[PDB]
Structures are given as C-alpha cells and as structure tokens.
C-alpha cells in the first residue's frame, strides 16, 4: 500500500523530470488519500502546489486556477499560490480573444 507520502515522492520526482502527466496522477492520488483522512507527514497545500502547476503545464488553465483557489482557501497567505493566481488570470484574459 502506497501512502500519501509515497504518492507525493513519486509525483515530486515526476515533476522534476518534467513529467507533468505522472505528477498530476500521483499528486491527485496523494490528495484523495489525504481527503479521506490519511494520517501523513505531507499536507494538502503541498500536494496542491505541485498539482496546480502540473495541470497548468499541460495546458488546463481553468483547472489550474480552481486548484489554486483551493490551495488559497486552505492557506490564504501562500506566496506562490497568490502569484500563480494572478499569473493564471492574466494569461486567461490575454487568451480570450
């Protein structure tokens, strides 16, 4: 049985490899396990940080934004997340044409 932390380690390495597809899959699995109440050294915000950017890297801005908003519900002061929100929004606005 792969734990939330196991999923996270796998996703983190995928991330560095820039394998965003597998980052999203592993990070998603981590999150679900967390959402279901798994007792883990890893936290939701950290999963969300990777997950949101991985989804972005694959071109789903809409979903990247939602995950970002989700992270910020949890950690409103999150620096990267706050930046990401404005960035994603900027690109989306410039996208609409």
């Amino acid at each position: 049985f792969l734990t939330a932390e196991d999923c996270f380690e796998l996703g983190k390495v995928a991330y560095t490899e820039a394998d965003y597809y597998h980052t999203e899959l592993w990070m998603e699995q981590a999150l679900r396990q967390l959402d279901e109440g798994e007792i883990s050294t890893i936290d939701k915000v950290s999963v969300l940080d990777y997950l949101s950017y991985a989804v972005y890297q694959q071109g789903d801005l809409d979903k990247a934004l939602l995950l970002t908003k989700k992270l910020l519900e949890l950690d409103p002061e999150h620096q990267r997340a706050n930046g990401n929100l404005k960035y994603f929004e900027y690109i989306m606005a410039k996208e609409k044409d």
């Binding site: 991330y15 560095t16 820039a18 940080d49 950017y53 890297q57 990267r80 930046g83 960035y87």
Partner: peptide
C-alpha cells in the same frame, strides 16, 4: 519550485 515561471 523547479520549472516555475519565476
């Protein structure tokens, strides 16, 4: 963060 825009 690794491949971040910043």
């Amino acid at each position: 963060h690794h491949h971040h825009h910043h």
